[PDB]
Amino acid sequence: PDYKFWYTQPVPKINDEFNESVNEPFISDNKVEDVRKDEYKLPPGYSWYVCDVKDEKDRSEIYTLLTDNYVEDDDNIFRFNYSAEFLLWALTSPNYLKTWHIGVKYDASNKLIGFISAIPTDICIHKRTIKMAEVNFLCVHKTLRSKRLAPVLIKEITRRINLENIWQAIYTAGVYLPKPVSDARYYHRSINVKKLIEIGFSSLNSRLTMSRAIKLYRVEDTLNIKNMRLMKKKDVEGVHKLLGSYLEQFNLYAVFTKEEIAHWFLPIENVIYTYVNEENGKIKDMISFYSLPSQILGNDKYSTLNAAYSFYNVTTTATFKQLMQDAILLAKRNNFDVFNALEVMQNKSVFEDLKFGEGDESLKYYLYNWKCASFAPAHVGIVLL
Ligand SMILES: C#CCCCCCCCCCCCC(=O)SCCNC(=O)CCNC(=O)[C@H](O)C(C)(C)COP(=O)(O)OP(=O)(O)OC[C@H]1O[C@@H](n2cnc3c(N)ncnc32)[C@H](O)[C@@H]1OP(=O)(O)O
Ligand SMILES: Cc1nn(C)c(C)c1NS(=O)(=O)c1c(Cl)cc(-c2ccnc(N3CCNCC3)c2)cc1Cl
Numbered sequence: 001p002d003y004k005f006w007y008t009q010p011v012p013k014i015n016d017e018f019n020e021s022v023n024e025p026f027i028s029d030n031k032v033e034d035v036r037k038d039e040y041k042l043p044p045g046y047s048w049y050v051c052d053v054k055d056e057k058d059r060s061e062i063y064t065l066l067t068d069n070y071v072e073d074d075d076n077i078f079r080f081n082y083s084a085e086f087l088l089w090a091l092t093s094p095n096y097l098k099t100w101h102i103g104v105k106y107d108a109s110n111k112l113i114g115f116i117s118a119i120p121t122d123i124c125i126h127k128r129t130i131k132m133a134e135v136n137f138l139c140v141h142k143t144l145r146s147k148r149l150a151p152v153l154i155k156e157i158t159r160r161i162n163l164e165n166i167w168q169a170i171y172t173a174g175v176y177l178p179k180p181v182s183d184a185r186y187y188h189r190s191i192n193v194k195k196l197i198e199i200g201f202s203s204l205n206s207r208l209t210m211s212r213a214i215k216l217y218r219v220e221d222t223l224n225i226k227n228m229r230l231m232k233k234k235d236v237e238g239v240h241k242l243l244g245s246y247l248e249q250f251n252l253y254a255v256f257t258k259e260e261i262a263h264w265f266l267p268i269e270n271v272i273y274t275y276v277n278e279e280n281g282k283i284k285d286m287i288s289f290y291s292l293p294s295q296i297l298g299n300d301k302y303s304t305l306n307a308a309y310s311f312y313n314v315t316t317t318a319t320f321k322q323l324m325q326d327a328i329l330l331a332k333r334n335n336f337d338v339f340n341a342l343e344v345m346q347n348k349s350v351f352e353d354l355k356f357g358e359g360d361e362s363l364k365y366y367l368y369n370w371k372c373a374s375f376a377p378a379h380v381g382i383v384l385l
């Protein structure tokens, strides 16, 4: 590929590799005063729109755009179906900016046909903490693909982020772009076996009959960590200490304030599930996973695959395998069909014994305007939504 757009940007070329001692911007000494004050030009008939995600109607417009036009698997069987409540949660973290929730409307219909978003986060990369933007939910309507709208959305959000004196970003994508700092495969743990077979997500053979498959993935309805319970407001301080200490071992992680811990972990039904083990008023273990269904395209019986995604999990009183076994159980108790995880942090070590199957795609982690050594995904300590 030529990367005609990306090679104009402060990112590594596809052949670039850096020593572990290199950890710095491509372009330093940036000046807010020099940032373009004009919005990037859109093709005739299209206009920028600042979305208010706290307004139900604006939020529903984003929801519809993404439901119909967002990420599909390579075989066009599944399309992500982020809920409206999920989008509210994902986009209104502490110190979010409404003007970083950017839509594009088709003037004649007044309909939203494009979107991109950013939220601010402090990112520790190779022990250096940098104020960054986390870019997500880039989407162009299926009818307008391959018209070079995505670089316009990227350049416009870059401009708006730069106006706030932020010059680095973090982002993930399934597509290969210049140039990942890490690459993490997805793994899947079947919960509702029969449904997964019926929709083609899983397979049988003459050895693995339907009944044998169901027995293989059967789980005992008893927690290894008996007191694991839904997180409450009183647990924010203890989760902040437990998770904050845990994440410092990694090469890439978010540095969460107490306010960010409250936002990202306090439970919201059908959005975010966090469980804690409290001993003597101290949080000693935590499990968390978020809800992200996929629409099943075309299937007669089922419209929705109900998937839980591993978020952040820490144990100090059990083994990591016991903890993730409880995570699977808690997902099953909340009626999820499958439990998905990336090979980040310590996750890969438990996939075999807990009967995860390797998927067929990976998530690439990227930094914008930052050069550093790449690393194996066990050194990644951040999960983006
Ligand atoms: C400081 C501060 C800096 C802030 C900025 C940091 C950089 C942020 C980059 C964006 C990160 C996005 C993270 C994600 O949210 S992930 C989910 C992506 N959402 C989907 O997968 C939904 C379904 N899909 C679509 O909605 C469209 O396919 C897209 C993704 C909008 C792409 O639009 P289309 O019509 O194909 O392509 P056009 O408009 O002709 O643009 C082509 C150029 O674009 C590049 N590109 C494509 N996908 C990308 C992508 N996902 N992220 C970034 N760049 C992408 C591509 O390579 C090429 O450029 P070159 O010529 O190769 O240099
Ligand atoms: C079962 C299923 N349902 N769907 C809808 C799909 C795609 C699958 N197959 S999958 O599990 O193997 C999978 C998964 Cl989960 C995710 C991605 C992917 C692609 C691009 N971008 C992201 N980002 C997520 C983080 N924020 C930025 C966007 C994820 C690709 C694959 Cl292929």
Ligand SMILES: [Cl-]
Pocket: 221, 222, 223, 226
């Ligand atoms: Cl129990």
